[PDB]
Design a protein around this nucleic acid. Structure first.
Lengths: 111, 226
DNA sequence: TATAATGGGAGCTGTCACGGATGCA
DNA sequence: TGCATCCGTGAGTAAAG
């Protein structure tokens, strides 16, 4: 279904705050921000989709994503909070794209 | 939810299929209802103060404390509760019942309490001299539903008693939330002075809790049954 | 890179007979 | 166990065009 202004603002906000949270998690863990984003995305989407990303320096298989998810789950409460932030941001990203898929059609029909 | 109408169910509360969720909504399934973007945030701010009252000794109903609605005294004839200080009247009417506060220069000199059954005979800001009627108590009088008497201290003087009540009650203040604002506080949580309730785009539209109180969410944009 | 924009158009047609798979009663 | 019904497929050679 099509979003209401409130749902749109809420999803966009969660997306922005999740990107900020991935930045903060890279600050803390000293890991790579892109690898962190890929791990959060992998868990949000499920094991249905897991593949090697071109920019990543490591091959993204369920073993390494479990390792990184464990290094994330072993954080203090005020640190591990950013993990939940990022997860909810990714879920909002997916639902925002899916909610606005109709606009693409209504534009592309004229090309 | 249509505009302005409120929810007949509460946030976090489990529901049943067919159970109506609002005056125009009936949930098709069972489970945990959830609020989507509450538009009005009401905070019940708590207040622990000290207020006095003088009554005939015959009408009094002696107790160590008073639960809400409980009878405080029963009067055979109309009685005039008179001022025992001189000042300007700060009238503060609750849902039912009121508080009178007297202040001389600016500092309060008397804080009275008029439970249900006492019609105040004064207007906010009025000047009162010592001994003039602040309220008439007619017949039985009882505590309001919104305020409770934690402790009671009495003093016998002549044919009257003077009660120094240790009162505790809550006062509501509403806040209007806009679609660009999000509630960062759950239902029924406790805030302090300085805690944030509703964030916004710019800091000057945020909702900060002035004092301590209990948060209540009303008028959600929609209700999500999961 | 910033008003808002939120579900598509074209079908197009005078066989024909068979063989084999699907669909009902 | 028997029928109607539908879908796919094939329907002459050389020449020029």
């Amino acid at each position: 279904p099509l979003l209401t202004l409130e749902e749109e603002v809420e999803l966009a906000r969660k997306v922005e705050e999740g990107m900020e949270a991935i930045k903060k998690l890279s600050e803390i863990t000293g890991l790579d921000p892109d690898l962190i984003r890929e791990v959060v995305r992998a868990k949000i989407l499920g094991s249905a989709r897991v593949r090697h990303i071109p920019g990543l320096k490591e091959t993204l298989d369920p073993k390494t994503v479990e390792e990184i998810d464990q290094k994330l789950k072993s954080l203090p409460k005020e640190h591990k909070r950013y993990l939940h932030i990022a997860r909810e941001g990714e879920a909002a990203r997916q639902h925002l794209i899916e909610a606005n898929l109709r606009l693409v059609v209504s534009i592309a029909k004229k090309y | 939810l249509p505009p302005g109408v409120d929810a007949l169910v509460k946030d976090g509360e489990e529901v049943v299929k067919g159970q109506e969720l609002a005056p125009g909504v009936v949930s098709r399934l069972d489970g945990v209802a959830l609020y989507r973007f509450p538009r009005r945030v009401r905070v019940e701010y708590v207040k622990k103060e000290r207020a006095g009252l003088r009554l005939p000794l015959a009408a009094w109903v002696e107790k160590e404390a008073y639960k809400p609605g409980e009878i405080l005294a029963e009067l055979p004839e109309p009685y005039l509760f008179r001022a025992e200080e001189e000042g300007v009247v700060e009238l503060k009417e609750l849902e039912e019942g009121a508080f009178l506060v007297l202040r001389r220069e600016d500092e309060p000199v008397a804080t009275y309490f008029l439970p249900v059954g006492m019609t105040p005979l004064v207007v906010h800001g009025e000047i009162v001299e010592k001994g003039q009627p602040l309220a008439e108590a007619k017949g039985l009088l009882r505590m309001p539903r919104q305020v409770r008497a934690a402790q009671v201290e009495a003093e016998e003087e002549g044919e009257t008693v003077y009660l120094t009540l240790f009162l505790e009650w809550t006062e509501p203040k509403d806040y209007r939330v806009q679609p660009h604002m999000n509630v960062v506080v759950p239902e029924g949580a406790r805030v302090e002075a300085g805690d944030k309730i509703v964030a916004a785009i710019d800091p000057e539209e945020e909702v900060i809790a002035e004092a301590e109180g209990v948060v209540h969410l009303h008028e959600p944009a929609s209700i999500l049954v999961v």
